[PDB]
Design a protein around this ligand. Structure first.
Ligand SMILES: *[C@H](C)[C@H]1/C(=C/c2[nH]c(/C=C3N=C(/C=C4\NC(=O)C(CC)=C4C)C(C)=C\3CCC(=O)O)c(CCC(=O)O)c2C)NC(=O)[C@@H]1C
Ligand SMILES: *[C@H](C)[C@H]1/C(=C/c2[nH]c(/C=C3N=C(/C=C4\NC(=O)C(CC)=C4C)C(C)=C\3CCC(=O)O)c(CCC(=O)O)c2C)NC(=O)[C@@H]1C
Ligand SMILES: *[C@H](C)[C@H]1/C(=C/c2[nH]c(/C=C3N=C(/C=C4\NC(=O)C(CC)=C4C)C(C)=C\3CCC(=O)O)c(CCC(=O)O)c2C)NC(=O)[C@@H]1C
Ligand SMILES: *[C@H](C)[C@H]1/C(=C/c2[nH]c(/C=C3N=C(/C=C4\NC(=O)C(CC)=C4C)C(C)=C\3CCC(=O)O)c(CCC(=O)O)c2C)NC(=O)[C@@H]1C
Ligand SMILES: CCC1=C(C)/C(=C/C2=NC(=C\c3[nH]c(/C=C4\NC(=O)[C@H](C)[C@H]4CC)c(C)c3CCC(=O)O)/C(CCC(=O)O)=C2C)NC1=O
Ligand SMILES: CCC1=C(C)/C(=C/C2=NC(=C\c3[nH]c(/C=C4\NC(=O)[C@H](C)[C@H]4CC)c(C)c3CCC(=O)O)/C(CCC(=O)O)=C2C)NC1=O
Ligand SMILES: CCC1=C(C)/C(=C/C2=NC(=C\c3[nH]c(/C=C4\NC(=O)[C@H](C)[C@H]4CC)c(C)c3CCC(=O)O)/C(CCC(=O)O)=C2C)NC1=O
Ligand SMILES: CCC1=C(C)/C(=C/C2=NC(=C\c3[nH]c(/C=C4\NC(=O)[C@H](C)[C@H]4CC)c(C)c3CCC(=O)O)/C(CCC(=O)O)=C2C)NC1=O
Ligand SMILES: CCC1=C(C)/C(=C/C2=NC(=C\c3[nH]c(/C=C4\NC(=O)[C@H](C)[C@H]4CC)c(C)c3CCC(=O)O)/C(CCC(=O)O)=C2C)NC1=O
Ligand SMILES: CCC1=C(C)/C(=C/C2=NC(=C\c3[nH]c(/C=C4\NC(=O)[C@H](C)[C@H]4CC)c(C)c3CCC(=O)O)/C(CCC(=O)O)=C2C)NC1=O
Lengths: 144, 160, 65, 160, 41, 161, 48, 169, 160, 161, 161, 161
């Protein structure tokens, strides 16, 4: 909408897409089951066009020579997200265990607990306590 | 200002500021009384500016005053007239500091999406600052018009 | 030698980069050799160190890490 | 230079060129004719500076010249005047650039590891460039000797 | 997915009519669907 | 963490016995009310950029907090108080589909009591913000789900006290 | 010292921070540079 | 990155010489245009967020073979990414305009750009037209701003053309 | 539960729950009455099948009841039936929960190293649960056996 | 980080008013002393291995502390002690360049008072070494700028004690 | 990564038209064969230990590749050469459910020629090991979806040799 | 390339001096053993199919490097391997006759360690072959000339390992 704000009318698009929705759900009056599916889906098309753009997410070089860049919020939202495994303190144990699965998977490139049956077990206990943070669990793994 | 560009630039490289920026610090600090010719002539001529630009906006784009718009009620229009002099306040922070560091961290970081949290759209409010520039630069003298013109010009790029 | 620290470190970039915010005011053992680089890193983000307490280490040795 | 340092800082935040660094650069480039007629007079009198600071060093540090010191012998004390010939030659690159990134990338960042590997005392160079400063301020006029003398004073801080 | 194909199998043959329902409220002077540059077979 | 299904599983585990007749009726109450919660959570989806708007307009705008000297005066601090309000809605629908207060004791409340005092955020407007968020969605999604939505809304503001 | 100079860097704590795991930042998750576009995805493979 | 001053430093450093008469007159030739460099760089960033918007609408009205489903500018996932990937060419042209030479363009934007676009399927062809539309649409706001114009401010741009595009002849 | 895996997948992505995966909760609670009837028919029928399938493990492993075996005597075999009956609640815990992790957080996290202590083999305790899932599938119908039996051969694979 | 320019920006912004006369009398005082502070920051950085040497050779060498028994006997304690005195001087010059001690409140005096009692570091000796480093610095830069470091040298000593 | 959904949409989208009736017939076949292979994917995922134990015994045991001089002689390489075989079983579940073997070519077949030659493992022994898994996956599943497995399954061993 | 006379010229040419009395005894030690090396080469060439026969008979024959699971097994790879062992002996005749190992470092040791990893033939068997060639040769020629032939044998073995 903020692309076509100069050429097209923003008010003409909302009234066109609403009656595009209303005439399409009038075609689905017979099945009685998919009409509420497309009413959920056309309402995404109306409500996403209601808002304006979000801003561009921007990376910054903390080194002075590495250049800063920019990325559209669209382009990050379309690609899949890497599963960020945050570990907080009092979470449950199975949800605690797949974090320390993935911490080995990040550093040692594969799950060497599952595949080689080895990994230092005293460090996980300080990790699962909430004693050391996840920054420290990487660093004491890196000096091992 | 220039001094917080240098200390935050010399802390992570763990070194004293060298002469390439110490000459750059001292060159800003001899231009205060030149910059103070610009900062009060914006100050006492504030209310002459604040509705000469506000009439300039709605004669250019009347939809914020049109019924169903944004400042169609008076409690929104009293808010929106306030935000001009708020923007005239923080621009004059920048001309005093001679840099971006007040004009970043007060009224510019994150405004592209938090007008969208409100009702006000983005690019009409870009037109509000652009008419506020010519409402101020006509009041300014010409040889110091070109100094204060990039500080108004940054707000056009960062908001759109 | 290692000592725990309570510190609250806001980021001042999560408005720009639009990341998932992790909730600070943590407690962690930082070792003695790695601490002042990590302490200076709390100052670069402007976070405020609340409490530093010596966990283990017996302050005053000449040998013994 | 300063123009690299203003771009590289503005590239890291990924914005355009600010009104801050538009005026650091413009104030640099209207001082560009002033710094080259500073830096010519160093190169115009390079045989006098090296001879006078060579006369000024060896009376301050006679452990160097005396045998068993490093610069002992007519081939070795000719190299220590050549060892100071480079640092006078580098300072003229720093005066023209307006910063010390010619000094940093060429003559600073590995000095203490090199001069430990050569046998010379490191602080004895830091007296010599300081003695090289004391004949360079007698060349120029007063308002320029504060500018060119700061580039000498940066090089002392790299050594000691 | 068998239901989800049937929603598309009602909309694909009705999409040529549904723009003529849509564009006829926002356009006045010309019978617009004929102006549609549809992708040819 | 623990679902209301699994909370009866964990309490019967430390009871050590089988799923008895008292364990059925608690589990049948979640399954009889399971279709409300997915119907509740599917319409926070299309209004996730809208419920945050008027709740700010009901309890936060036209006040001293957006004035100079107020804590969300500058637009960096305005952007976080919509960001930190957007996360409190999204994590509260996780409590809706779980049917527990326990998803939110430790994903949310584990550091908020000390961060807001360290950052100088006044808690006394945040409780008014979530209570503004409680009234708007009950008139949005329906009365029976908004009764269920307001329960875990009360866990996050009393948990912020 | 090498793992000390990288995990304590401000490049680390700005992005990952304190209580999350490191994750590799491929294309789409953030903007990616053009100078090292070649050997970055080649480094992100399992054949690294 | 590497200024016209600092390129003349290691043009003279590697041979181990001082600053002679040719060094003192080529560097003065850079400094007499430095007032014209900086004021052109202000008015390029006068409407630089508008200047990419006027260029790409003039691009895509000229080459529709990039709007209709063909080459990749199809969705707003591509189009708003296209306006960002256009905006780097405007923003880095501001830096080398001030820096004198094109060595900022040489190792920030040009290196890997033949290999980034080939990995995505982004064509190198209309990117050259996109800088070629920004070639003269930058000179308009310098001309309407009263700055003189010339090889400086119309060079950074064809160094993004003659080195990015592959050699035919 | 199956809510809990779908909740923490959305949080580790920091993503809102998409309506293409809200059907897994709606299809759960339609079958939530149906899954309780699987645990309802394993409620009153539990009291027969544990005593039978203990004998089937003794046919497959006669070294258990041998002198010198790990379950020799009365009370070594009396708790070993009780050590098997611990698992029978767990599969009925996972039917109502609908997924893996209530079996996992109670029984299968440390099972490879706790039976390593007291000497009962993992390759002995597995196929008694295969003896369990044979007779438990006998009381079920055709559709009930494929769903309830799917939790068993996970745990068989989780032993071996 | 608050410059004395940016400090009176922030104290004017919390009221939301423009710059008054008494605020400008802080700027025009600060714009007057610009060339003085830049002359001091050069000659400290040219002497920053000698200001840190003549402070410790005056006050701390041949004392209790360099002798065996307390706190500077081993070389790793001596390397850590000259690491602090270098870092105090490098952080004092920023407050001389800013004209505000907010650098010292943010970057130096955060964890330092707690970590010295937690390590057994004598505060009463290192409050003297910065006190000994003042009159070296007041002689090395000239007493006009020597009366400028004395605010920010003893802002450490006001905080660390 | 990609999908049979992405293969039918982008084939229609670069044409720009709507869904073809021949493009429906791919998806009408695709959603029909879900329940004939979703139930196959549960049985494959359950018996992952019994498949790999059988398939390494049908083709790789008691040979020169197990004996010294071979590449499965140490126990570190033998444990890897189970999990290197286990990932091809797991990624064959992915290309069965996605309905498209383009999950394999740039996630599991991408660096597969590079790691195997840099360690020098016989590629001709892997394909003999992988084609041994086609027999054991048919008896656990059935002849209907054993055909549906083996199309995506032989795409691994085609790209290896 | 160069020999014991050409090198001691080229050692004394690049100094700029003439042939001193410190380099003539390098020639006189060569010319004293000049008649010894020429009798050493003329028994190598008369037995050159038997030195390569007895070398492989102690290391490679009847092992399992010539097994069907082996490197040697196909007779294309056998006749190369005798010939790849021919070229180690024939150049070792040359360097003994030259008195300098420079002909070994140009043609034999050109890229030989990097060809062998690129081929897959083992290096640890090749050092076992030439050290079996060394003990056959010194018995045949004589314990004087077998010592100087043993240097140029092991100079290849220093380059392979
Ligand atoms: C105005 C009443 C009508 C209208 C006109 C219009 N649109 C454009 C430009 C674009 N339209 C798109 C459309 C889409 N992008 C998408 O991702 C989707 C969802 C699949 C749609 C529908 C895009 C990318 C552009 C920009 C590229 C282009 O030029 O086509 C114009 C041209 C604007 C200009 O001159 O710069 C006009 C006149 N758009 C509407 O929505 C109304 C139907
Ligand atoms: C638009 C007018 C043209 C076009 C653009 C287009 N670009 C992309 C993607 C990228 N462009 C870059 C380029 C750079 N990155 C840099 O760091 C630099 C130096 C500063 C440059 C020049 C990169 C890395 C990408 C990848 C995405 C990312 O930024 O991380 C796309 C997206 C491709 C897609 O379909 O997904 C598009 C559309 N394409 C055109 O057709 C126009 C010619
Ligand atoms: C010096 C004359 C006095 C002294 C110094 C001393 N300090 C330490 C240890 C530390 N010092 C610091 C200092 C800082 N951290 C900061 O962020 C800043 C602001 C820039 C400063 C000045 C820290 C963090 C430590 C602990 C970590 C470390 O490894 O250094 C020691 C070492 C103590 C030991 O037992 O090894 C010493 C000796 N102590 C004295 O005796 C003098 C009074
Ligand atoms: C005997 C003491 C115990 C026992 C042994 C047993 N082993 C197998 C099968 C294999 N054993 C190996 C052994 C090794 N591989 C190694 O890398 C090392 C270290 C160098 C060893 C010891 C291998 C590779 C196999 C697979 C068959 C093969 O060699 O190709 C069996 C047969 C199992 C089968 O399925 O055939 C048995 C019975 N079992 C016991 O009861 C003893 C305790
Ligand atoms: C310190 C930096 C900063 C500023 C200046 C700021 C302003 C600001 N402007 C607002 C609203 C507004 N802003 C506008 C403005 C416009 N509509 C148009 O058509 C015009 C283009 C533009 C006219 C100037 C209007 C009409 C409202 C009222 C909308 C509402 O609150 O419902 C609001 C919400 C309600 C209010 O307080 O009035 C804030 C907080 N916020 C900040 O953080
Ligand atoms: C998902 C669970 C969760 C929550 C809720 C959460 C909140 C959270 N809100 C924060 C800040 C903030 N919160 C506010 C909020 C407010 N200011 C006001 O004026 C109002 C009174 C109020 C809201 C109504 C502001 C202004 C900041 C920024 C503080 C600063 O930048 O100085 C911060 C500090 C770092 C940051 O700025 O992001 C956290 C961690 N974090 C979490 O992990
Ligand atoms: C669900 C979580 C859970 C696990 C994993 C568990 C294991 C478990 N097995 C035990 C005993 C035992 N379990 C067995 C079991 C067997 N011997 C055989 O040969 C058979 C193969 C097999 C069972 C069919 C035996 C012989 C003992 C006694 C061990 C001893 O006293 O030496 C005991 C000690 C007595 C008791 O409290 O039951 C525990 C705690 N209990 C649990 O609650
Ligand atoms: C047990 C470990 C240990 C070490 C290493 C140590 C070094 C040490 N050497 C010192 C002084 C000194 N050390 C020297 C020694 C030398 N300079 C020369 O020219 C000689 C060749 C050379 C002898 C190797 C001198 C001359 C001083 C006095 C420096 C001065 O007063 O300026 C001082 C300062 C006075 C004090 O407080 O003790 C320390 C701490 N002290 C220790 O307790
Ligand atoms: C997700 C895509 C992907 C996969 C699957 C993958 C596998 C992979 N297989 C490996 C090794 C291996 N793979 C084998 C495999 C075999 N040996 C045989 O003789 C059999 C014929 C064959 C099994 C079919 C062996 C023996 C090794 C160990 C080589 C070594 O580490 O020395 C390694 C070596 C690193 C290590 O030592 O852990 C990786 C990374 N890498 C990837 O990036
Ligand atoms: C003097 C200059 C010179 C060098 C360096 C030379 C080296 C040489 N040795 C080679 C091969 C070879 N090298 C060996 C190695 C051996 N034979 C064995 O069986 C043992 C395992 C081992 C030594 C004890 C084998 C088996 C081949 C043939 C490899 C093959 O055909 O695949 C090859 C590859 C030729 C080919 O295979 O077509 C070259 C170029 N030829 C030369 O004229």
């Amino acid at each position: 909408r903020e692309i076509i704000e100069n050429a097209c009318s923003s008010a003409a698009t909302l009234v066109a897409l609403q009656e595009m929705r209303r005439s399409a759900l009038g075609y689905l009056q017979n099945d009685k089951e998919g009409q509420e599916i497309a009413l959920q889906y056309f309402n995404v098309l109306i409500s996403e066009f209601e808002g304006a753009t979000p801003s561009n997410k921007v990376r910054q070089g903390q080194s002075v020579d590495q250049q800063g860049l920019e990325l559209p919020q669209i382009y990050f939202n379309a690609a899949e997200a890497r599963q960020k495994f945050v570990m907080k303190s009092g979470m449950s144990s199975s949800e605690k265990l797949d974090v320390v699965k993935a911490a080995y998977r990040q550093v040692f490139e594969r799950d060497i607990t599952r595949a080689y049956s080895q990994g230092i077990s005293d460090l996980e206990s300080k990790f699962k306590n909430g004693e050391i943070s996840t920054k420290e669990f990487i660093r004491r793994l890196g000096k091992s | 200002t220039v001094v917080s560009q240098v200390i935050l630039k010399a802390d992570d490289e763990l070194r004293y500021p060298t002469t390439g920026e110490l000459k750059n610090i001292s060159d800003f600090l001899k231009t205060g009384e030149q910059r103070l010719r610009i900062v009060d002539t914006l100050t006492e001529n504030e209310k002459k500016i604040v509705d000469r630009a506000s009439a300039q906006l709605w004669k250019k784009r009347p939809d914020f005053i049109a019924p169903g718009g944004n400042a169609a009620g008076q409690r929104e229009r009293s808010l929106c007239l306030r935000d001009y002099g708020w923007y005239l306040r923080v621009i004059t922070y920048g001309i005093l500091s001679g840099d971006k560091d007040p004009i970043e961290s007060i009224g510019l970081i994150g405004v592209k999406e938090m007008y969208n949290s409100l009702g006000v759209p983005m690019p009409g409010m870009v037109e509000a600052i652009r008419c506020l520039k010519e409402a101020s630069l006509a009041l300014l003298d010409d040889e110091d018009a070109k100094e204060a013109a990039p500080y108004f010009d940054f707000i056009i790029q960062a908001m759109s | 030698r290692s000592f725990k620290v309570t510190a609250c470190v806001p980021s001042q970039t999560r408005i720009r980069t639009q990341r998932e915010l992790q909730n600070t005011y943590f407690t962690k053992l930082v070792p003695y050799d790695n601490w002042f680089r990590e302490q200076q890193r709390i100052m670069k983000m402007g976070g405020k160190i609340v409490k530093v307490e010596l966990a283990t280490g017996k302050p005053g040795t000449n040998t013994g890490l | 230079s300063i123009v690299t340092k203003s771009i590289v800082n503005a590239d890291a935040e990924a914005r355009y060129l600010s009104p801050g660094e538009l005026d650091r650069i413009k104030s640099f480039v209207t001082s560009g004719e002033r710094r080259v007629r500073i830096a010519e007079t160093m190169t115009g009198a390079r045989e006098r500076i090296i001879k006078e600071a060579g006369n000024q060093l060896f009376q301050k540090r006679p452990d160097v010249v005396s045998p068993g010191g490093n610069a002992y012998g007519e081939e070795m004390t000719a190299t220590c005047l050549r060892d100071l010939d480079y640092y006078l030659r580098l300072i003229t690159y720093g005066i023209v650039a307006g910063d010390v990134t010619p000094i940093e990338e060429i003559g600073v960042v590995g000095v203490r590891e090199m001069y430990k590997s050569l046998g010379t005392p490191i602080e004895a160079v830091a007296e010599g460039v300081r003695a090289m400063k004391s004949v360079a301020t007698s060349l120029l006029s007063g308002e320029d000797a504060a500018e060119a003398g700061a580039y000498f004073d940066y090089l002392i801080g790299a050594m000691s | 997915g068998a239901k989800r194909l049937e929603i598309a199998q009602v909309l694909t043959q009705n999409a040529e009519l549904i723009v003529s329902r849509a564009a006829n409220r926002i356009f006045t002077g010309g019978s617009p669907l004929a102006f549609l540059e549809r992708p040819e077979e | 963490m623990q679902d209301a299904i699994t909370s009866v599983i964990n309490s019967s585990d430390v009871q050590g016995k089988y799923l008895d007749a008292s364990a059925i009726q608690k589990l049948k109450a979640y399954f009889a009310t399971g279709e409300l919660r997915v119907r509740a959570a599917t319409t926070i989806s299309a209004n996730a950029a809208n419920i945050v708007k008027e709740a700010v307009a009901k309890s936060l705008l036209y006040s001293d907090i957006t004035r100079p000297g107020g804590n969300m005066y500058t637009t960096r601090r305005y952007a976080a108080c919509i960001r930190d309000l957007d996360y409190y809605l999204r994590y509260a629908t996780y409590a809706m589909l779980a049917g527990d207060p326990s998803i939110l004791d430790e994903r949310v409340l584990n550091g908020l009591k000390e961060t807001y005092n360290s950052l100088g955020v006044p808690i006394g407007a945040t409780v008014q913000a979530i209570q503004a968020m409680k009234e708007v969605t009950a008139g949005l999604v329906g009365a029976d789900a908004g009764k269920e939505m307001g329960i875990y809304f009360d866990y996050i503001c009393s948990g912020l006290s | 010292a090498l793992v000390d100079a990288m995990v304590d860097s401000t490049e680390y704590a700005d992005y990952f921070g304190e209580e999350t795991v490191p994750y590799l930042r491929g294309l789409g998750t953030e903007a990616q540079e053009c100078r090292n576009w070649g050997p970055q995805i080649d480094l992100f493979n399992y054949s690294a | 990155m590497r200024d016209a001053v600092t390129s003349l430093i290691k043009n003279y450093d590697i041979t181990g010489r001082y600053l002679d008469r040719d060094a003192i007159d080529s560097l003065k030739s850079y400094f007499v245009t430095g007032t014209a460099r900086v004021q052109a760089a202000a008015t390029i960033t006068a409407n630089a967020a508008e200047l990419v918007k006027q260029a790409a609408s003039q691009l895509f009205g000229d080459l529709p073979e990039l709007i209709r489903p063909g080459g990749n500018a199809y969705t707003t996932r591509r189009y708003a990414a296209c306006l960002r990937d256009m905006d780097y060419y405007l923003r880095y042209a501001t830096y080398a305009l001030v820096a004198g030479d094109t060595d900022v363009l040489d190792e920030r934007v040009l290196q890997g750009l033949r290999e980034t676009y080939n990995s995505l399927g982004v064509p190198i062809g209309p990117t050259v037209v996109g800088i070629g539309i920004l070639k003269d649409l930058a000179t308009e706001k310098v001309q309407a701003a009263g700055i003189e114009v010339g090889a400086y401010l119309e060079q950074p741009f064809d160094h993004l053309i003659s080195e990015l595009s592959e050699t035919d002849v």
